[PDB]
Design an enzyme around this catalytic site. Structure first.
Site, PDB file in Angstrom:
ATOM      1  N   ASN A   1      -8.913   3.971   5.680  1.00  0.00           N
ATOM      2  CA  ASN A   1      -8.191   4.213   7.092  1.00  0.00           C
ATOM      3  C   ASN A   1      -8.825   2.923   7.890  1.00  0.00           C
ATOM      4  O   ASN A   1      -8.274   3.118   9.276  1.00  0.00           O
ATOM      5  CB  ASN A   1      -8.037   5.423   7.365  1.00  0.00           C
ATOM      6  CG  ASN A   1      -7.037   6.311   6.675  1.00  0.00           C
ATOM      7  OD1 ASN A   1      -6.459   5.840   5.694  1.00  0.00           O
ATOM      8  ND2 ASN A   1      -6.988   7.586   6.785  1.00  0.00           N
TER       9      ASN A   1
ATOM     10  N   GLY B   1       4.508   7.515   3.294  1.00  0.00           N
ATOM     11  CA  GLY B   1       5.271   6.761   2.433  1.00  0.00           C
ATOM     12  C   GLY B   1       4.726   5.616   1.963  1.00  0.00           C
ATOM     13  O   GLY B   1       3.656   5.798   0.926  1.00  0.00           O
ATOM     14  N   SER B   2       5.202   4.562   2.071  1.00  0.00           N
ATOM     15  CA  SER B   2       4.944   3.383   1.693  1.00  0.00           C
ATOM     16  C   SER B   2       4.420   2.275   2.940  1.00  0.00           C
ATOM     17  O   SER B   2       5.064   2.466   4.127  1.00  0.00           O
ATOM     18  CB  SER B   2       5.739   2.414   0.757  1.00  0.00           C
ATOM     19  OG  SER B   2       6.608   1.603   1.568  1.00  0.00           O
ATOM     20  N   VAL B   3       3.714   1.400   2.714  1.00  0.00           N
ATOM     21  CA  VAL B   3       3.470   0.074   3.970  1.00  0.00           C
ATOM     22  C   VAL B   3       3.749  -1.353   3.470  1.00  0.00           C
ATOM     23  O   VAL B   3       3.328  -1.584   2.288  1.00  0.00           O
ATOM     24  CB  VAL B   3       1.902   0.155   4.345  1.00  0.00           C
ATOM     25  CG1 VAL B   3       1.032   0.296   3.487  1.00  0.00           C
ATOM     26  CG2 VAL B   3       1.523  -0.700   5.293  1.00  0.00           C
TER      27      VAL B   3
ATOM     28  N   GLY C   1       0.893  -1.278  -0.006  1.00  0.00           N
ATOM     29  CA  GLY C   1      -0.109  -0.038  -0.031  1.00  0.00           C
ATOM     30  C   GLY C   1       0.831   1.216   0.056  1.00  0.00           C
ATOM     31  O   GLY C   1       2.016   1.144  -0.123  1.00  0.00           O
ATOM     32  N   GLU C   2       0.357   2.425  -0.052  1.00  0.00           N
ATOM     33  CA  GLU C   2       0.882   3.558  -0.014  1.00  0.00           C
ATOM     34  C   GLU C   2       0.424   4.493   1.068  1.00  0.00           C
ATOM     35  O   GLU C   2      -0.970   5.162   0.722  1.00  0.00           O
ATOM     36  CB  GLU C   2       0.775   4.325  -1.218  1.00  0.00           C
ATOM     37  CG  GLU C   2       1.090   3.592  -2.669  1.00  0.00           C
ATOM     38  CD  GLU C   2       2.543   3.441  -2.688  1.00  0.00           C
ATOM     39  OE1 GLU C   2       3.392   3.690  -1.637  1.00  0.00           O
ATOM     40  OE2 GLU C   2       3.057   2.703  -3.787  1.00  0.00           O
TER      41      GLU C   2
ATOM     42  N   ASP D   1      -4.227   4.323  10.892  1.00  0.00           N
ATOM     43  CA  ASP D   1      -3.349   5.637   9.903  1.00  0.00           C
ATOM     44  C   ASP D   1      -3.740   6.833  10.645  1.00  0.00           C
ATOM     45  O   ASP D   1      -3.892   7.821  10.001  1.00  0.00           O
ATOM     46  CB  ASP D   1      -3.945   5.244   8.459  1.00  0.00           C
ATOM     47  CG  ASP D   1      -3.397   4.334   7.648  1.00  0.00           C
ATOM     48  OD1 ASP D   1      -2.665   3.437   8.281  1.00  0.00           O
ATOM     49  OD2 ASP D   1      -3.435   4.114   6.591  1.00  0.00           O
TER      50      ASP D   1
HETATM   51  N1  LIG Z   1      -1.988  -3.402   8.905  1.00  0.00           N
HETATM   52  C1  LIG Z   1      -1.947  -3.862   7.708  1.00  0.00           C
HETATM   53  O1  LIG Z   1      -2.182  -4.978   7.462  1.00  0.00           O
HETATM   54  N2  LIG Z   1      -1.852  -2.828   6.780  1.00  0.00           N
HETATM   55  C2  LIG Z   1      -2.226  -3.151   5.519  1.00  0.00           C
HETATM   56  C3  LIG Z   1      -2.193  -4.449   4.851  1.00  0.00           C
HETATM   57  C4  LIG Z   1      -2.911  -4.225   3.736  1.00  0.00           C
HETATM   58  C5  LIG Z   1      -2.728  -5.347   2.819  1.00  0.00           C
HETATM   59  C6  LIG Z   1      -3.117  -6.616   3.463  1.00  0.00           C
HETATM   60  C7  LIG Z   1      -3.375  -7.689   2.468  1.00  0.00           C
HETATM   61  C8  LIG Z   1      -3.123  -7.656   0.975  1.00  0.00           C
HETATM   62  C9  LIG Z   1      -3.069  -6.204   0.562  1.00  0.00           C
HETATM   63  F1  LIG Z   1      -2.755  -6.241  -0.583  1.00  0.00           F
HETATM   64  C10 LIG Z   1      -2.862  -5.364   1.517  1.00  0.00           C
HETATM   65  S1  LIG Z   1      -3.016  -2.805   2.920  1.00  0.00           S
HETATM   66  C11 LIG Z   1      -2.728  -1.936   4.562  1.00  0.00           C
HETATM   67  C12 LIG Z   1      -2.585  -0.695   4.880  1.00  0.00           C
HETATM   68  O2  LIG Z   1      -2.058  -0.244   6.037  1.00  0.00           O
HETATM   69  N3  LIG Z   1      -3.243   0.037   3.928  1.00  0.00           N
HETATM   70  C13 LIG Z   1      -3.298   1.625   4.148  1.00  0.00           C
HETATM   71  C14 LIG Z   1      -2.687   2.278   3.129  1.00  0.00           C
HETATM   72  C15 LIG Z   1      -2.972   3.672   3.501  1.00  0.00           C
HETATM   73  C16 LIG Z   1      -4.279   4.164   3.848  1.00  0.00           C
HETATM   74  N4  LIG Z   1      -5.243   3.269   4.534  1.00  0.00           N
HETATM   75  C17 LIG Z   1      -4.891   1.862   3.911  1.00  0.00           C
END
Ligand SMILES: NC(=O)Nc1cc(-c2cccc(F)c2)sc1C(=O)N[C@H]1CCCNC1
Ligand SMILES: [Cl-]
Ligand SMILES: [Cl-]
Ligand SMILES: [Cl-]
Ligand SMILES: [Cl-]
Ligand SMILES: [Cl-]
Length: 253
Positions: A139, A20-22, A17-18, A152
């Site tokens: 979020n 910065g980056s996650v 994800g974005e 977030d």
């Molecule tokens: N904690 C966790 O697993 N995080 C997490 C996990 C994600 C995730 C989990 C499984 C498959 C996949 F493609 C993404 S995405 C994400 C995350 O924190 N995304 C944010 C981006 C910024 C805006 N809000 C969502």
């Protein structure tokens, strides 16, 4: 502090994800086992960071994401460490649910439970005088049991009219972002204010116009989300009032 995790206990994986980056991650834990984590980078000043993280690490609620700690790779670049959630963000989940490949049509009873879960999370943060400031379905994270937690914590169509005007922000601006989130869930992922552009949004709201009742949406549910957008912050309910309105409506189906 007891919030800092050693960089050696952490192995970093693929970008998820974005925000910065996650990233995907392995946390080596005190008991010799490894734990799946998400690692999110951040845009001295790091003392105020560490101090905020130290504060958030004391949060404990099923509907708030645990902050497991922070790493500092060295120019110091800090990283927030979070339990990994394979079901990703709510907003994406709602969009996926409208495809045959993705999750089954979400019934309204489950859509209301997502809203109850966020209310419970925001009730708990509100009590500790913590302001989110970026509540939106993108979020909110889904746990393995399909419970929602808010995330977030520290987008003009989520910003409350008083926050657009005066650059003021209270728990009651959070309540405004919560009703928009409630609408994102009832619409299963529509952008707020179709046929209105970001630059038009302050004037749209100033003339008294609001998010329109979705087609599925129950009148009683639309009355609750409408209450979150009353002009005067003081006229909006608290998260504790909202949680119980939603809990009570869910009980009556
Ligand atoms: N904690 C966790 O697993 N995080 C997490 C996990 C994600 C995730 C989990 C499984 C498959 C996949 F493609 C993404 S995405 C994400 C995350 O924190 N995304 C944010 C981006 C910024 C805006 N809000 C969502
Ligand atoms: Cl690594
Ligand atoms: Cl999924
Ligand atoms: Cl309207
Ligand atoms: Cl609308
Ligand atoms: Cl309407």
């Amino acid at each position: 502090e007891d919030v800092v995790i050693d960089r050696n206990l952490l192995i970093l994986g693929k970008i998820l994800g974005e925000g910065g980056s996650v990233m995907e991650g392995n946390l080596k834990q005190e008991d010799g086992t490894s734990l799946k984590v998400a690692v999110k980078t951040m845009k001295r000043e790091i003392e105020e960071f560490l101090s905020e993280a130290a504060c958030m690490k004391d949060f404990s609620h099923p509907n708030v994401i645990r902050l497991l700690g922070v790493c500092i790779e060295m120019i110091p670049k800090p990283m927030v460490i979070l339990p990994f959630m394979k079901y990703g963000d709510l907003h994406t989940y709602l969009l996926y649910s409208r495809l045959e490949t993705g999750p089954k049509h979400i019934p309204l009873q489950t859509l209301l439970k997502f809203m109850v879960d966020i209310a419970l999370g925001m009730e708990y943060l509100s009590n500790r005088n913590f302001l989110h400031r970026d509540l939106a379905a993108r979020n909110c994270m889904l746990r393995d049991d399909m419970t929602v937690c808010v995330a977030d914590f520290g987008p003009v169509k989520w910003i409350a009219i008083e926050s657009l005007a005066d650059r003021v922000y209270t728990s009651k601006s959070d309540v405004w972002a919560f009703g928009v989130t409630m609408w994102e869930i009832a619409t299963r992922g529509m952008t707020p204010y179709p046929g209105v552009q970001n630059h038009e949004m302050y004037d749209y709201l100033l003339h008294g116009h609001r998010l329109k009742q979705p087609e599925d949406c129950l009148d009683e549910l639309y009355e609750i989300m409408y209450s979150c957008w009353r002009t005067d912050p003081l006229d909006r309910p608290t998260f504790s009032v909202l949680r119980l309105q939603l809990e009570k409506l869910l009980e009556s189906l």
